[PDB]
Design a protein around this ligand. Structure first.
Ligand SMILES: NS(=O)(=O)c1ccc(CCN(Cc2cccc(NCC(=O)O)c2)S(=O)(=O)c2ccccc2)cc1
Ligand SMILES: NS(=O)(=O)c1ccc(CCN(Cc2cccc(NCC(=O)O)c2)S(=O)(=O)c2ccccc2)cc1
Ligand SMILES: [Zn+2]
Length: 257
Protein backbone atom coordinates (compact mmCIF):
# COMPACT_ATOMS: atom_id res chain seq x y z
CA UNK A 1 0.00 0.00 0.00
CA UNK A 2 1.05 3.62 -0.67
CA UNK A 3 2.61 5.85 1.99
CA UNK A 4 5.47 8.24 2.69
CA UNK A 5 8.38 5.77 3.26
CA UNK A 6 11.46 5.13 0.98
CA UNK A 7 9.74 2.15 -0.48
CA UNK A 8 6.14 3.38 -0.99
CA UNK A 9 6.38 7.24 -1.03
CA UNK A 10 5.41 9.85 -3.63
CA UNK A 11 8.00 8.75 -6.26
CA UNK A 12 6.31 5.26 -6.29
CA UNK A 13 2.63 6.30 -6.47
CA UNK A 14 2.46 6.52 -10.30
CA UNK A 15 2.87 2.69 -10.56
CA UNK A 16 -0.61 2.15 -9.04
CA UNK A 17 -2.05 5.61 -9.77
CA UNK A 18 -0.81 6.74 -13.20
CA UNK A 19 -2.66 10.11 -12.92
CA UNK A 20 0.27 10.98 -10.55
CA UNK A 21 1.98 12.21 -13.79
CA UNK A 22 -1.20 14.02 -15.02
CA UNK A 23 -1.88 17.55 -16.20
CA UNK A 24 -3.41 19.08 -13.05
CA UNK A 25 -1.55 17.53 -10.08
CA UNK A 26 -1.17 19.08 -6.64
CA UNK A 27 0.54 20.49 -4.71
CA UNK A 28 2.48 23.18 -6.63
CA UNK A 29 4.95 25.92 -5.93
CA UNK A 30 3.21 29.32 -5.81
CA UNK A 31 5.51 31.79 -7.58
CA UNK A 32 4.20 35.02 -6.06
CA UNK A 33 5.65 37.21 -8.83
CA UNK A 34 3.94 35.10 -11.62
CA UNK A 35 0.48 34.77 -9.94
CA UNK A 36 -1.85 37.42 -11.39
CA UNK A 37 -4.39 39.48 -9.42
CA UNK A 38 -7.81 38.61 -10.87
CA UNK A 39 -10.23 41.51 -10.00
CA UNK A 40 -13.13 39.25 -11.20
CA UNK A 41 -12.70 36.79 -8.24
CA UNK A 42 -15.50 37.24 -5.65
CA UNK A 43 -14.83 37.56 -2.00
CA UNK A 44 -14.62 34.17 -0.37
CA UNK A 45 -17.45 33.21 2.05
CA UNK A 46 -16.44 30.80 4.86
CA UNK A 47 -19.70 30.01 6.74
CA UNK A 48 -18.78 27.70 9.66
CA UNK A 49 -21.12 29.01 12.43
CA UNK A 50 -23.32 25.79 12.28
CA UNK A 51 -20.43 23.31 11.87
CA UNK A 52 -21.06 19.94 13.59
CA UNK A 53 -17.76 18.04 14.17
CA UNK A 54 -18.28 14.35 14.98
CA UNK A 55 -15.08 12.32 15.25
CA UNK A 56 -11.30 12.31 14.88
CA UNK A 57 -9.63 9.36 13.07
CA UNK A 58 -6.00 8.27 12.63
CA UNK A 59 -6.15 6.80 9.09
CA UNK A 60 -2.52 5.70 8.95
CA UNK A 61 -1.52 8.74 6.77
CA UNK A 62 -2.78 11.71 8.86
CA UNK A 63 -5.68 12.35 11.20
CA UNK A 64 -9.09 13.54 9.96
CA UNK A 65 -11.56 15.66 11.93
CA UNK A 66 -14.89 14.67 10.40
CA UNK A 67 -18.07 16.76 10.16
CA UNK A 68 -21.78 16.10 9.58
CA UNK A 69 -22.15 17.02 5.85
CA UNK A 70 -25.76 15.66 5.53
CA UNK A 71 -27.05 19.38 5.46
CA UNK A 72 -25.62 22.91 4.55
CA UNK A 73 -24.07 23.50 8.05
CA UNK A 74 -20.45 24.50 7.31
CA UNK A 75 -20.04 25.71 3.72
CA UNK A 76 -17.56 27.43 1.46
CA UNK A 77 -18.86 29.72 -1.32
CA UNK A 78 -17.67 32.64 -3.46
CA UNK A 79 -14.08 33.24 -4.48
CA UNK A 80 -13.46 31.19 -7.64
CA UNK A 81 -16.34 28.81 -6.77
CA UNK A 82 -19.75 28.37 -8.49
CA UNK A 83 -22.29 26.97 -5.99
CA UNK A 84 -22.06 25.58 -2.50
CA UNK A 85 -19.31 23.34 -1.08
CA UNK A 86 -19.93 21.44 2.18
CA UNK A 87 -17.16 20.81 4.75
CA UNK A 88 -16.62 17.05 5.17
CA UNK A 89 -13.28 16.89 7.05
CA UNK A 90 -10.02 18.63 7.79
CA UNK A 91 -6.52 17.23 8.19
CA UNK A 92 -2.90 18.38 8.19
CA UNK A 93 0.40 17.49 6.54
CA UNK A 94 3.59 18.13 8.58
CA UNK A 95 7.31 17.53 8.77
CA UNK A 96 9.91 15.87 11.00
CA UNK A 97 11.60 19.34 11.33
CA UNK A 98 10.14 22.90 11.28
CA UNK A 99 11.76 23.62 7.88
CA UNK A 100 9.53 21.17 5.99
CA UNK A 101 5.98 19.79 6.10
CA UNK A 102 3.81 21.89 3.81
CA UNK A 103 2.66 20.55 0.44
CA UNK A 104 2.25 23.87 -1.32
CA UNK A 105 5.33 26.14 -1.26
CA UNK A 106 5.57 29.89 -1.68
CA UNK A 107 8.54 31.02 -3.78
CA UNK A 108 9.98 27.55 -2.87
CA UNK A 109 9.50 28.26 0.90
CA UNK A 110 8.25 25.25 2.87
CA UNK A 111 6.15 25.84 5.97
CA UNK A 112 6.18 23.54 9.04
CA UNK A 113 2.72 22.17 8.20
CA UNK A 114 -0.40 22.72 6.06
CA UNK A 115 -4.07 22.44 7.04
CA UNK A 116 -6.57 21.21 4.44
CA UNK A 117 -10.28 21.94 4.96
CA UNK A 118 -12.01 19.66 2.45
CA UNK A 119 -15.36 20.57 0.88
CA UNK A 120 -17.56 18.93 -1.80
CA UNK A 121 -19.87 20.54 -4.36
CA UNK A 122 -23.48 19.85 -3.32
CA UNK A 123 -24.64 19.71 -6.98
CA UNK A 124 -23.09 16.15 -7.13
CA UNK A 125 -25.05 14.85 -4.14
CA UNK A 126 -22.26 12.96 -2.29
CA UNK A 127 -18.48 13.05 -1.89
CA UNK A 128 -17.88 9.91 -3.96
CA UNK A 129 -19.71 11.41 -6.97
CA UNK A 130 -18.00 14.79 -6.48
CA UNK A 131 -14.44 13.39 -6.73
CA UNK A 132 -15.32 12.15 -10.26
CA UNK A 133 -15.90 15.78 -11.43
CA UNK A 134 -13.36 18.49 -12.37
CA UNK A 135 -15.18 20.93 -10.06
CA UNK A 136 -16.16 18.40 -7.40
CA UNK A 137 -14.04 19.56 -4.42
CA UNK A 138 -12.73 22.79 -2.94
CA UNK A 139 -9.81 22.52 -0.53
CA UNK A 140 -8.95 25.49 1.63
CA UNK A 141 -5.21 25.30 2.42
CA UNK A 142 -3.66 27.18 5.36
CA UNK A 143 0.05 27.26 6.16
CA UNK A 144 1.37 26.68 9.71
CA UNK A 145 4.56 28.32 11.01
CA UNK A 146 6.07 27.68 14.44
CA UNK A 147 5.91 30.63 16.88
CA UNK A 148 3.06 31.49 19.26
CA UNK A 149 0.49 28.82 20.17
CA UNK A 150 -2.81 28.65 18.25
CA UNK A 151 -5.46 28.48 21.02
CA UNK A 152 -8.05 26.99 18.65
CA UNK A 153 -5.73 24.06 17.82
CA UNK A 154 -5.18 22.92 21.44
CA UNK A 155 -8.41 20.75 21.61
CA UNK A 156 -7.03 18.85 18.58
CA UNK A 157 -3.50 18.48 20.07
CA UNK A 158 -4.88 17.16 23.38
CA UNK A 159 -6.92 14.29 21.84
CA UNK A 160 -4.01 12.93 19.76
CA UNK A 161 -2.75 10.62 22.56
CA UNK A 162 -6.13 8.81 22.31
CA UNK A 163 -5.65 8.11 18.52
CA UNK A 164 -1.95 7.39 18.49
CA UNK A 165 -2.10 4.50 16.02
CA UNK A 166 -3.73 3.66 12.67
CA UNK A 167 -7.41 2.83 12.88
CA UNK A 168 -8.09 4.52 16.22
CA UNK A 169 -10.86 7.09 16.46
CA UNK A 170 -12.38 9.22 19.23
CA UNK A 171 -15.50 11.35 19.71
CA UNK A 172 -14.74 14.93 18.62
CA UNK A 173 -17.96 16.89 18.98
CA UNK A 174 -18.38 20.66 19.37
CA UNK A 175 -15.08 21.66 17.72
CA UNK A 176 -15.22 25.07 15.96
CA UNK A 177 -12.96 25.14 12.86
CA UNK A 178 -13.15 28.99 12.81
CA UNK A 179 -10.42 28.82 15.48
CA UNK A 180 -7.95 27.52 12.85
CA UNK A 181 -8.29 30.46 10.39
CA UNK A 182 -5.90 33.44 10.08
CA UNK A 183 -7.19 37.04 10.14
CA UNK A 184 -7.07 37.62 6.35
CA UNK A 185 -8.86 35.51 3.72
CA UNK A 186 -6.55 36.75 0.89
CA UNK A 187 -5.74 33.68 -1.30
CA UNK A 188 -4.27 32.10 -4.36
CA UNK A 189 -6.33 29.67 -6.46
CA UNK A 190 -5.66 27.12 -9.19
CA UNK A 191 -7.19 23.87 -10.51
CA UNK A 192 -5.52 20.74 -9.13
CA UNK A 193 -5.88 17.37 -7.52
CA UNK A 194 -6.03 15.35 -4.33
CA UNK A 195 -2.47 15.25 -2.91
CA UNK A 196 -2.75 11.56 -1.88
CA UNK A 197 -3.82 8.52 -3.92
CA UNK A 198 -6.08 8.26 -5.74
CA UNK A 199 -4.75 11.71 -6.87
CA UNK A 200 -8.04 12.56 -8.62
CA UNK A 201 -8.06 15.82 -10.62
CA UNK A 202 -11.22 17.17 -8.93
CA UNK A 203 -10.00 20.04 -6.71
CA UNK A 204 -10.30 23.81 -6.88
CA UNK A 205 -7.39 24.81 -4.56
CA UNK A 206 -7.78 27.96 -2.44
CA UNK A 207 -4.54 28.62 -0.53
CA UNK A 208 -4.54 31.41 2.04
CA UNK A 209 -1.66 33.91 1.94
CA UNK A 210 -1.47 34.42 5.72
CA UNK A 211 -0.10 31.51 7.72
CA UNK A 212 -1.32 30.65 11.21
CA UNK A 213 1.16 30.40 14.10
CA UNK A 214 1.31 27.23 16.22
CA UNK A 215 3.72 26.50 19.08
CA UNK A 216 6.67 24.10 19.00
CA UNK A 217 4.83 22.06 21.69
CA UNK A 218 1.71 21.81 19.46
CA UNK A 219 3.59 20.50 16.37
CA UNK A 220 5.72 18.19 18.62
CA UNK A 221 2.46 16.43 19.54
CA UNK A 222 1.61 15.93 15.83
CA UNK A 223 5.01 14.25 15.45
CA UNK A 224 4.25 11.73 18.27
CA UNK A 225 1.44 10.15 16.22
CA UNK A 226 2.13 6.79 14.56
CA UNK A 227 1.68 5.52 10.99
CA UNK A 228 1.62 1.94 12.41
CA UNK A 229 -1.25 0.11 14.06
CA UNK A 230 -1.42 -0.80 17.76
CA UNK A 231 1.07 -3.47 18.83
CA UNK A 232 3.32 -2.87 15.75
CA UNK A 233 6.87 -1.42 15.75
CA UNK A 234 6.66 2.35 16.09
CA UNK A 235 7.00 4.52 13.00
CA UNK A 236 6.40 8.14 13.80
CA UNK A 237 3.84 9.96 11.65
CA UNK A 238 6.08 12.66 10.17
CA UNK A 239 6.81 13.92 6.66
CA UNK A 240 3.35 12.99 5.35
CA UNK A 241 3.57 15.61 2.56
CA UNK A 242 3.76 15.28 -1.25
CA UNK A 243 6.36 17.57 -2.93
CA UNK A 244 5.45 20.24 -5.49
CA UNK A 245 4.36 18.92 -8.90
CA UNK A 246 4.78 20.47 -12.36
CA UNK A 247 2.44 23.41 -13.00
CA UNK A 248 2.02 22.49 -16.71
CA UNK A 249 -0.66 24.53 -18.51
CA UNK A 250 -2.05 26.28 -15.37
CA UNK A 251 -2.26 29.80 -14.03
CA UNK A 252 -2.35 30.63 -10.35
CA UNK A 253 -4.66 33.62 -9.63
CA UNK A 254 -4.39 35.97 -6.67
CA UNK A 255 -7.41 37.47 -4.90
CA UNK A 256 -5.33 40.48 -3.75
CA UNK A 257 -3.26 43.27 -5.32
N1 LIG B 1 2.33 2.52 -6.12
S1 LIG B 1 2.04 2.52 -4.49
O1 LIG B 1 2.72 3.69 -3.92
O2 LIG B 1 0.59 2.35 -4.27
C1 LIG B 1 2.87 1.08 -3.88
C2 LIG B 1 2.21 -0.13 -3.73
C3 LIG B 1 2.91 -1.23 -3.24
C4 LIG B 1 4.25 -1.13 -2.89
C5 LIG B 1 5.00 -2.27 -2.25
C6 LIG B 1 5.12 -2.17 -0.73
N2 LIG B 1 6.13 -3.11 -0.19
C7 LIG B 1 7.59 -2.75 -0.11
C8 LIG B 1 7.83 -3.35 1.51
C9 LIG B 1 8.14 -2.30 2.37
C10 LIG B 1 8.29 -2.53 3.73
C11 LIG B 1 8.14 -3.81 4.25
C12 LIG B 1 7.84 -4.86 3.40
N3 LIG B 1 7.58 -6.13 3.87
C13 LIG B 1 7.23 -6.42 5.24
C14 LIG B 1 5.76 -6.79 5.31
O3 LIG B 1 4.93 -5.87 5.29
O4 LIG B 1 5.48 -8.01 5.39
C15 LIG B 1 7.69 -4.62 2.04
S2 LIG B 1 5.60 -4.62 0.16
O5 LIG B 1 4.82 -5.06 -0.96
O6 LIG B 1 6.75 -5.36 0.57
C16 LIG B 1 4.14 -4.66 0.97
C17 LIG B 1 2.85 -4.51 0.48
C18 LIG B 1 1.79 -4.43 1.37
C19 LIG B 1 2.02 -4.51 2.74
C20 LIG B 1 3.31 -4.66 3.22
C21 LIG B 1 4.38 -4.74 2.34
C22 LIG B 1 4.88 0.10 -3.04
C23 LIG B 1 4.21 1.20 -3.54
N1 LIG C 1 -4.71 16.26 0.76
S1 LIG C 1 -6.07 16.63 0.03
O1 LIG C 1 -6.75 17.74 0.72
O2 LIG C 1 -5.82 16.85 -1.37
C1 LIG C 1 -7.17 15.26 0.15
C2 LIG C 1 -6.69 13.98 -0.14
C3 LIG C 1 -7.49 12.88 0.06
C4 LIG C 1 -8.78 13.01 0.53
C5 LIG C 1 -9.46 11.73 1.02
C6 LIG C 1 -10.91 11.76 0.77
N2 LIG C 1 -11.50 10.59 1.47
C7 LIG C 1 -11.16 9.24 0.96
C8 LIG C 1 -11.62 9.04 -0.47
C9 LIG C 1 -10.78 9.32 -1.52
C10 LIG C 1 -11.23 9.23 -2.81
C11 LIG C 1 -12.52 8.85 -3.09
C12 LIG C 1 -13.38 8.58 -2.05
N3 LIG C 1 -14.67 8.25 -2.36
C13 LIG C 1 -15.68 7.95 -1.38
C14 LIG C 1 -15.51 6.52 -0.86
O3 LIG C 1 -14.52 5.81 -1.28
O4 LIG C 1 -16.33 6.18 -0.03
C15 LIG C 1 -12.93 8.66 -0.74
S2 LIG C 1 -11.97 10.72 3.05
O5 LIG C 1 -11.07 9.89 3.81
O6 LIG C 1 -12.14 12.11 3.35
C16 LIG C 1 -13.57 10.01 3.10
C17 LIG C 1 -13.80 8.86 3.85
C18 LIG C 1 -15.07 8.31 3.85
C19 LIG C 1 -16.09 8.90 3.13
C20 LIG C 1 -15.85 10.04 2.39
C21 LIG C 1 -14.59 10.61 2.38
C22 LIG C 1 -9.27 14.31 0.79
C23 LIG C 1 -8.48 15.42 0.60
ZN1 LIG D 1 -4.31 17.18 2.45
Amino acid sequence: HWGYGKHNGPEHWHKDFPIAKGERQSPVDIDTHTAKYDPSLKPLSVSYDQATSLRILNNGHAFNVEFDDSQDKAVLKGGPLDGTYRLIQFHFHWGSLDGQGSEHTVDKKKYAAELHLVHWNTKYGDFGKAVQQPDGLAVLGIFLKVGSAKPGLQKVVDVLDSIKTKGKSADFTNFDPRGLLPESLDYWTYPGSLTTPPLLECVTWIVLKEPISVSSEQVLKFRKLNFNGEGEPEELMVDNWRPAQPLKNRQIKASFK
